[PDB]
Every structure is written in structure tokens, then in C-alpha cells.
């Protein structure tokens with residue numbers, strides 16, 4: 508078996524290898540990459556996502572979200588408070604202000620220490636789930652707006668045509684903005700490209716051990732667990748690496764820098780934080796190997812995690828017994 512310790516693998520495709528997206532994901536899996544839950548892909552030196560980022564300041568962030576924490580430093584939840592609209596240029600200036608800017612630090616380890624020590628005491632603002640793309644139309648390789656759609660994958664694999672679409676999203680981050688522990692909707696894959704700015708640190712549990720994280724989360728967030736059998740789908744819970752280690756949860760960590768892709772694999776729980784002002788683009792995707800994960804994916808039906816109407820068909824087709832109850836959630 509490849510990659511038995513479930514380490515995060517890093518890939519360096521050549522420009523020839525970067526032509527066929529699906530073929531390369533399959534190659535990474537052949538080497539055991541999915542066992543970690545997460546992989547890093549560094550693009551060939553000849554590739555570029557777009558010519559410059561000099562003209563992105565007028566993009567609007569319609570609903571910036573202030574991420575307010577409750578709990579303790581290593582075990583906390585966050586809720587999102589809506590703020591007034593601001594442009595990307597306005598947001599950048601805010602992220603760089605004295606109130607929000609990254610503190611002085613020695614290296615990524617020292618900043619990680621400061622994140623986990625002090626996160627709960629601040630409420631950073633972030634731009635999320637902004638439909639759009641910053642890839643140039645003429646970037647032909649690994650353009651996140653041009654990948655096979657999940658609908659088309661389901662049709663190709665299972666024979667039925669369904670409604671829905673699958674487009675990318677933009678994320679604007681600042682120091683301490685946080686992504687809570689979760690898997691993707693329907694336990695899909697994700698791909699994430701860090702366009703511009705400061706890094707993003709990631710934490711990931713191997714898919715084979717996801718239920719260990721779930722069990723710990725039910726112990727650490729008992730009221731939430733009583734409220735919903737799939738509360739992690741609410742995307743509000745954080746557990747620090749120190750608490751994970753104390754509890755024996757297998758995980759790994761890695762820092763993504765601008766110009767790098769990260770791929771999350773089905774049922775790979777992940778969480779993380781931004782080092783400073785940055786912009787990422789992400790989209791969910793499927794492969795044939797996903798179908799079995801989508802059939803088994805847990806669902807939130809308490810109401811709290813509402814999602815894409817594109818997800819309706821996936822539940823309807825892959826999980827017909829659950830459909831009725833889930834549809835009520837939405």
C-alpha cells in the first residue's frame with residue numbers, strides 16, 4: 508500500500524503533466540496522496556494563473572463576515588457576523604491596519620503559536636464564497652473555472668442527467684481568519700489556489716480516521732452534538748493541534764504559499780488559518796472514486812448548514828432514503 512503513514516505529499520508536475528487534470532489527480536492517488544486527505548501541487552515554472560493582480564481592487568465583497576469566537580484557546584466555536592459591503596481594495600487596507608495586521612514573528616512556527624494562543628481574543632473579517640474567478644480565460648491548464656463539472660461526472664458514471672452547476676468561489680482573508688473543521692459538501696474533493704498574498708496553514712485528518720475526529724468533536728462540543736448528528740457541517744468548530752495530540756487524533760499540517768494549489772480528498776477533514784491578506788479561489792470537484800463517498804456522506808438536516816441547490820440533486824440521486832428529511836432541512 509502507498510503512503511501508509513498518510514503523510515501530506517507534494518507534487519511538482521511538469522508542463523506536460525499539467526495538461527490533463529483528471530489524469531494527474533489519478534496519478535497522485537496512485538501514489539497514495541489521498542490517504543493524507545490533502546496534497547500540495549506546485550505548478551510548473553512556465554505556468555501562470557493570470558498576468559497580474561494589479562486590477563482586482565474593485566471586486567466587491569458584498570457581505571464581509573466578522574468571525575467571533577467563543578470557548579477556550581484550543582477548543583472554540585466561531586460565528587459569523589455580517590458587516591457592510593466593501594471593495595477588495597478597501598478590504599486590503601483594513602487587513603493591513605494596525606488592528607488587523609499580522610504581528611511581528613520569526614517564522615511560520617512562531618506565527619502558528621501566536622494564532623493558537625491569541626485567536627479567540629480577536630474577531631478578524633473575511634470575504635467568503637464570492638462567486639467568481641481570477642484565472643485568465645487563456646490559462647488552459649488547471650483553470651478552476653474550466654474543470655469537469657460534478658453533474659457531468661455523475662452523468663458519465665451513473666447515466667442520469669441532473670440539473671445544477673458548479674462554479675468557483677473567491678475568498679479574501681486576513682490574519683487569523685479561520686476555516687473550521689469540516690469535510691466538503693457530500694464529501695467531495697476540493698481544489699484551492701492561493702492567488703495572491705500571505706500564506707494559509709492547513710490541518711488535515713486522514714480520511715480513514717475521520718470518525719476519530721468526529722468522536723472527539725462530539726465530546727468537546729456536547730450541546731452541538733445533541734442538536735445535530737452532523738454538526739461539523741455547520742463549519743463552526745475549532746480544535747487546536749495541541750488538543751488533537753492530547754487526544755490521539757492522527758493529523759498533519761502544511762503551509763500553502765501564493766502560487767500553489769491544495770487538493771482535499773473525499774472525507775478528508777481540514778481546518779486552518781490565514782497569515783495575512785490574501786486571495787484564494789476554490790471549487791469542489793468529483794472523480795469516479797468519489798461516488799462511493801457521496802453515497803455515504805453524512806448530512807445535516809437540522810437546518811443550520813443550508814447549501815447550494817446544486818447539492819439537491821446529489822442527495823436525491825445518491826441518497827434517496829435521506830432525501831425527504833434533508834429537503835426539510837433546506
Ligand SMILES: Cn1nn[nH+]c1CC(=O)N[NH3+]
Pocket residue numbers: 678686691697699700771777787788789
Ligand atoms: C475555501 N478555501 N480556499 N482555499 N482554501 C480554502 C479552505 C477549504 O476549506 N477548502 N476546502
Ligand code: NI
Pocket residue numbers: 644652653
Ligand atoms: Ni472561463
Ligand code: NI
Pocket residue numbers: 689690691697771777
Ligand atoms: Ni474545505
Ligand SMILES: [Zn+2]
Pocket residue numbers: 734735736737738741807808809810811812
Ligand atoms: Zn445541523
